[PDB]
Design a binder for this molecule. Sequence first.
Ligand SMILES: Cc1ccnc2c1NC(=O)c1cccnc1N2C1CC1
Lengths: 555, 398
Amino acid sequence: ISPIETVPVKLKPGMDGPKVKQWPLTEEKIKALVEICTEMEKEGKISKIGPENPYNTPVFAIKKKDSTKWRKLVDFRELNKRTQDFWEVQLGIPHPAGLKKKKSVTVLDVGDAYFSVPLDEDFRKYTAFTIPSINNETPGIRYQYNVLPQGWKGSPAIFQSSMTKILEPFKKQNPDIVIYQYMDDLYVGSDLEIGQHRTKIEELRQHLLRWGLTTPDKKHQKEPPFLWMGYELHPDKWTVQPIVLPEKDSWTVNDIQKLVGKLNWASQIYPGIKVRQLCKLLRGTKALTEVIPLTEEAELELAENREILKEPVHGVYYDPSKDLIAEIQKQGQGQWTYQIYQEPFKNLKTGKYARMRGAHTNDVKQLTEAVQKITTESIVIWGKTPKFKLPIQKETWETWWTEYWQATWIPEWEFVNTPPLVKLWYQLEKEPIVGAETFYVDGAANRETKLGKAGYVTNKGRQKVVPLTNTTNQKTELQAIYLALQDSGLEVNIVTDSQYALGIIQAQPDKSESELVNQIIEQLIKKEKVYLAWVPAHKGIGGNEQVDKLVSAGI
Amino acid sequence: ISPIETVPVKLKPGMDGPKVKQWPLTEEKIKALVEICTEMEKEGKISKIGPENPYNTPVFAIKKKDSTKWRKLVDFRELNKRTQDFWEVQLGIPHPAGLKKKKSVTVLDVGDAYFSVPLDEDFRKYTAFTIPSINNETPGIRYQYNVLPQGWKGSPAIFQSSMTKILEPFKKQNPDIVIYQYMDDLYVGSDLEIGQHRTKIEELRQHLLRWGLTTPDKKHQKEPDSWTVNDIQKLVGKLNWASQIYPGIKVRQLCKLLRGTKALTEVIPLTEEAELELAENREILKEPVHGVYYDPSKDLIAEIQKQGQGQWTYQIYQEPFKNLKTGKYARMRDVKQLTEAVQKITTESIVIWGKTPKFKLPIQKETWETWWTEYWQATWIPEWEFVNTPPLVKLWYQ
Ligand SMILES: Cc1ccnc2c1NC(=O)c1cccnc1N2C1CC1
């Protein structure tokens, strides 16, 4: 019971009530599922016998772990399936990083709640179940619910909803003592002199109890630094709690998957944790029990992470509004990271940004990629975008968006002297240097035979070819550029028959992910003027027909 | 009291109401949205709270023009696929192939009409949606529409009879002025009436208000030597490549010119199969030369806008290298630039084809989801896709 207002529930169009029977655990079952089913009325009437005309559902008694009485179970999956797309789903996680601070909060849990709130009437008939009645020749004991049943998604949606109807008059009779709910759990908090908080908790617990929901407590029963989804929190600050136990090698992919788990959750506030190499190798591993060999560096990502994991990293000022909300990206963990903060020391939120995206999306381009995670993140956590303290500055940034082939927009960002990363490492001259030895590029290789060819041919009747075996044309065309650079100085104009090959260079990448490209970059960083230019894939172009030849024949 | 006075709106066989998302709106953005929705609820019918229906539809709050107040721009994109596209057969408002030919077009936001005037029955439940709460601290409750939603194409389909009669007294007093209703907007277009249109439009902006409350709040007057070798790497390269969106037309005897090697020297400049092919091609490049380029009201209109610098080139085409219109928007001093182009194009695809195109935007997926809703005024929502990594210009233009 509860004098509340029932929510209409229709069965997915076309379907009908569950026809699922079962077959007994003898006296163990029935006996347990009766000394209890009889209290489904006489001790809070939660169901009514009404055995013949309806459908059915799965009766089953369990209970074991840390208690003293045989619990019942009927998480009816058929009914469960004949209505379910039905409600709007419970779906959100308020990030502590933003929960503003109350002076004192409290978490009154709620009694058996998803059973207090009522359940329709032009429905209940499908929440029936048969308890065989007597021994073997058990006549047939049949009930059917009258309230939200345990394990039927109507329950959480309807419930979350019946309780915020009830919490409204209160939540109106006294604003400022605003609250939050996530399943039998009301995290009530306000900035009240503990004393009056003590009673205004009574009122909440009282207004509850006159709508059923008999909130079990003694005006706040619960260890004061609660366990959220992780997020051990307190009006003081918050944090995450137990974070490890990695014995020693025999490290299967099943484990590594969880370690990047354990590590990531932790990213929240522990500065500079950084999973690249520990999930790096985590590839293929199509099987849990595949004890993947760790690596050299993973040891460092666990290492450098290990020591980081002390306790000189905990909480935030929570949202404390009126303060700019600076967010600086102290980026450069051989990857990119950030911390959202408010005032001086203690941080607000710590989050990384490793970029598993690109043929080396530059510092500049990786940085931007990161501002729209913070920007996106901020917008959700506090409902606004942050002031940005960026290790970049005009020029570098300035010119790149100004001249990058795609679009982007960034909030107030301001620079700070630190490890620069301003990737203006190498730029390309737009007008073919004259009084320069233009090299003709071409590399090739066969599909079947792994026979590749590192070409090139200049206007000074020069030429060379370095053979390669075990490549693909889109590799030979890059060594086909490395050479040209490697066999010249200062200037140098390269002509190629590859849109791809240049796309790399032109994107002006960085970081070793493909050593040809890794060096085709270092050359550039130090070669006074360069100028890649494209020429139609072969088709007899001047200079290109020539080299074309060199690298072709040999296949 | 109305009272009963609906129209039987329904969904295509094998369908369910949208169950979209709702982008996490800036707080101020919700603050208003929460206002717009409360006046709406007390303004009756237009909205009423739901609680056991799953359908949801993205909702944004924005401003329009030089800005002062806000406005909800509700994203019925899947309810369209879900209803309109189906209920696009009968109710449908067909498209006048002269509206473009009538060179001057003013468009009126005659959409407020859709509200209280008519309504949904038995189907209100699909126009559901939610107004958030920063960080989901509260279950930011959801409303339901009880009148024609100023958003979905399903409305004007309903409102074409009321709208027709209303515009009737004018369609005569002022005979053939092509009037096209598309979706909450009217493209009343006309011949180059010497700057005039200013007149007739306000004449109609007024006729609407007299003979009805259909209100296009305000006149709304949208009243419209060195021929270096490398030079051929360029010339040829693209030339060779232009004609691809053409048949195999000559370039080669201009081509071959660069034989041997040596790239900073000038070639010619003066030759047969050179000048008489550079030009031969030169005259070949003029919009109308085309071919079997046709619209097939049956295959989607794809579009690809290419960021130019201060300028932005765009290209609406139905299927591969066969552009059906390929011009350039361009306003010096940029996300909020694409914003103005993606709108310019759709507002033009419409006047021309009765349907917006599917955008392939050169922007990071999410740097758009964060603020397309900044300088985005128009009420419809072109369906876009983020195509990146990358396009190929270095010409295409000149
Ligand atoms: C887990 C959780 C989720 C949402 N809000 C809160 C909490 N619980 C708290 O203990 C809490 C801590 C600090 C500030 N607000 C808090 N509260 C708010 C209600 C006072």
